[PDB]
Amino acid sequence: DNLETPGARDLLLQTASNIMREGDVVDISLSELSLRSGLNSALVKYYFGNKAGLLKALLDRDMENIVKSVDALLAKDDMSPEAKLRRHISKCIDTYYDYPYLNRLLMRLVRDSDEAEAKRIADQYLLPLHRAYNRFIGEGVKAGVFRPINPQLFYFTVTGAADRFFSARLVLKHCFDQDTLTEQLRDSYREHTVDFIMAGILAH
Amino acid sequence: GARDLLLQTASNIMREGDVVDISLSELSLRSGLNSALVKYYFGNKAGLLKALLDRDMENIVKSVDALLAKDDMSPEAKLRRHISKCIDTYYDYPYLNRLLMRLVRDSDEAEAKRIADQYLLPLHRAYNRFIGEGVKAGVFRPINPQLFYFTVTGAADRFFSARLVLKHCFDQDTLTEQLRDSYREHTVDFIMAGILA
Numbered sequence: 001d002n003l004e005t006p007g008a009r010d011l012l013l014q015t016a017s018n019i020m021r022e023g024d025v026v027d028i029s030l031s032e033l034s035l036r037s038g039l040n041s042a043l044v045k046y047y048f049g050n051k052a053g054l055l056k057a058l059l060d061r062d063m064e065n066i067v068k069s070v071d072a073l074l075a076k077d078d079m080s081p082e083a084k085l086r087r088h089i090s091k092c093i094d095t096y097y098d099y100p101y102l103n104r105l106l107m108r109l110v111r112d113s114d115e116a117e118a119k120r121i122a123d124q125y126l127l128p129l130h131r132a133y134n135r136f137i138g139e140g141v142k143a144g145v146f147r148p149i150n151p152q153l154f155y156f157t158v159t160g161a162a163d164r165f166f167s168a169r170l171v172l173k174h175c176f177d178q179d180t181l182t183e184q185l186r187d188s189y190r191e192h193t194v195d196f197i198m199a200g201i202l203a204h
Numbered sequence: 205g206a207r208d209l210l211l212q213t214a215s216n217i218m219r220e221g222d223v224v225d226i227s228l229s230e231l232s233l234r235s236g237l238n239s240a241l242v243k244y245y246f247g248n249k250a251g252l253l254k255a256l257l258d259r260d261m262e263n264i265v266k267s268v269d270a271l272l273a274k275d276d277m278s279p280e281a282k283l284r285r286h287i288s289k290c291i292d293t294y295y296d297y298p299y300l301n302r303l304l305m306r307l308v309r310d311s312d313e314a315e316a317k318r319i320a321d322q323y324l325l326p327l328h329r330a331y332n333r334f335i336g337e338g339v340k341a342g343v344f345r346p347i348n349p350q351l352f353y354f355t356v357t358g359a360a361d362r363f364f365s366a367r368l369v370l371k372h373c374f375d376q377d378t379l380t381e382q383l384r385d386s387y388r389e390h391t392v393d394f395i396m397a398g399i400l401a
Contacts, residue, residue, distance in 0.1 A: 024305075024309060025309065103361075103365065107364075107365060107368055107369075110368055110369060110372050110373065111222055111223070111368060111372070113372060118372040118373050119373075121373065122373040126369065126373060147397070149390070150383075150386065150390060152383070153383070153386065153387055153390045156362060156365065156366050156369075156387065157362065157390070157391070157394055159365065160358055160361065160362045160365070163301075163358055163361040163362070163365070164351075164354040164355060164358045164361075166305075167301065167305060167354050167357070167358060167361070168350070168351075168354050170305055170308060170309055171305075171308055171324065171354075174308045174309060174311060174316050175308060175311075175316045175317070175319065175320040175324060176320070189351070192347070192348055192351050193351065195345075196347065196351070196355070196398040196399075197398070199345065199397060199398045199399075200394045200395075200397045200398040201397075204397070204400070
C-alpha cells in the first residue's frame, strides 16, 4: 500500500472548484488541475481515478454543506421556524455563491448515471433534503408561519439559486464585460436572494 | 415547412433527451428530412442552435411589449400575466437557458452584443422600469431587477432540473407527472410572492 499524504486530496478538490467557478462550465482540464495545484497527474489518478471520479468527489464535498445544514434545521432549540429556515437558506445561498456550478454538476452526474448511481445520488443528496423539508415546512404551514406550499417543489426552487448565480456570472462576463459574483458583492447578493426566498414562503 | 419542422424536431429531441448537443442523424430520422436540408437551412450545428434560440425567444420577447403597455390592468396583474407566459414557454422549452448560456459562452463580441440587445436587455430594462414604478406605488418590495431577471429567466433551468431529476430518481408514474406539472403554477406563485409588498 501507499504512505499517506495529508492535504493533497483537499487541495485537488479546492483547485478543481476554483477552476470550475472561474470558467462558467461544469468541466475541468486535468493539465490545468495539475498546473494550478502543483500536484502531478499521478496523484490525481490515485485519489480520483479519472475526471468522472474527480467530479463525483467534488459533488460529495460541496453537498456536505447543504446536507449538514439540515440537522440544525431539524434540531430542537429556542428558534422560531422562520429564523431556523432563514439560517438554513442563508447557508444554502452562501454555499451556492461559493459553488455556483453545484446544481449543474449534480445534473451532469444524474444525467450520466446508471441506475445504482442515480439511487445513490437520491439517497445521499435529494431524499434527506426532501424528507427534512416535508417535516419542517409541513409543521410551519400547520403553525401558520408558511403559506401552503409543496415542500419538495420548495426545495427545487431553492436549488435554483445556484443556476441563477452561474447564469449571472457567465452573462455579465460575456455580454457586459463585468465581473459579478465577487467577494465584495457576496453579502448583498446573499441577503437579496434569501429575502426573496423567505418572502416567497412566509404567510404574508 | 421543412425549416420549421427541423427546428421543432430538434426542440423535441432536446426536451426529451436532457441535452443541447443533438445528433444530426436523429434529427434527420425523426423529421423525415435529409440531412442535406439541415446544412442548407442552417449551415452547421451552431446555426441550427442559433435559429432554435431565436424561435423560442419569440414569445418571451413579445410578452415584454404586453408588460409595458399602458393598458389599465393593475401592476400585479400585468406582471402575473407576463410571468405566466414566460413560465409556459420555459416549461415547453426547458433547455432554453442552457441553450442561451452555451451561445453566450461561445460568442464573439458581435454575437454577445446581438444576444444582449435582442434577448437579455429588453427584459431587464422592462423589469428595471416596472419594479421601480411599482416600488414607488407601494405594490412591490424593493428588489433588484438584475437578480429578478435571472430569477424569471432561470425558470427554464428549474424546469430542466426537475424534469431530469424526476426522470432518473423518481417513479415514472402519474404522481411524478403531476408533480412536474404542478411546478409551473408553483413557480409563478413563488415569483409573485417574492416581489409583492
